[PDB]
Amino acid sequence: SEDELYRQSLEIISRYLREQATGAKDTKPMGRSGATSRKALETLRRVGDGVQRNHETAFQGMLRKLDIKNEDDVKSLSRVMIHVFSDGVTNWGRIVTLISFGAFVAKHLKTINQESCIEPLAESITDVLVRTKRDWLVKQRGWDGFVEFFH
Ligand SMILES: CC#CCn1c(CC)c(-c2cccc(Cl)c2C)c2c(N[C@H](Cc3ccccc3)C(=O)O)ncnc21
């Protein structure tokens, strides 16, 4: 390991997706740069909840199209994130939509009683995000850049 950016990203995304699914704020330290991952998570809650709320109908229609039922559909969803998220313009706007739709999908995984697929979903999203937009993420100062961008 010793990929700080991947570790920090996976943590923030797992916390958001897990707490959206279940309602509970997970109380367990944070990790390295914990004040930058707690301010990132705070921001993500504000802006991410906003995107799910404002574009609920769009999110519902996309979820319906993907027809997600098991670990096999979540594993596949990865090829879908590469086509849609990676093959686009790069900005925090689309990065939030990716993690917000992931949270929307994580809520659906809980309701269809497949909540063991949440942590893998979070890993899939972090994989596509960090190992297709690494160059851009580094240039923007990673999650310090994100928190700054949503002042
Ligand atoms: C988990 C995951 C994932 C991948 N992903 C997906 C899922 C395939 C979409 C997407 C594409 C079309 C419609 C909808 Cl509702 C969505 C969510 C997406 C995305 N969408 C925005 C457009 C948009 C913004 C806000 C609300 C609805 C739609 C875009 O393409 O610029 N941006 C980034 N990643 C996206």
Q: What is the DSSP string of 29-92?
A: ---TTHHHHHHHHHHHHHHHHHHHHHTHHHHHHHHHHHT--SHHHHHHHHHHHIIIIISS--SH
Atom index in ligand 1 nearest the CA of residue 124 equals 1
From residue 47, give the alpha-carbon distance in Å to each of 42, 74, 116.
Answer: 9, 24, 26
Q: For the chain, give every domain's residue range.
A: 4-149
| Ligand 1 binding pocket includes 55 (Cβ within 6 Å) | yes
Positive or negative, the CA dihedral 124, 110, 43, 61 is positive
Contacts of 116 (CB under 8 A, 6+ apart): 71
The resolution, in Å, is: 2.8
Indicate if ligand 1 lies below 6 Å from the C-beta of 97.
Answer: yes
Cβ contact 17:107 at 8 Å: no
Task: Evaluate: CB of 58 within 6 angstroms of ligand 1.
Answer: yes
User: Token match 């994989």: residue?
Assistant: 127
At the second CATH level, the architecture of 4-149 is Orthogonal Bundle (1.10)
Per the entry, the structure determination technique was X-ray
Tokens at 71, concatenated: 């670990």
Q: Point out the ligand 1 atom lying closest to the alpha carbon of residue 104.
A: 1
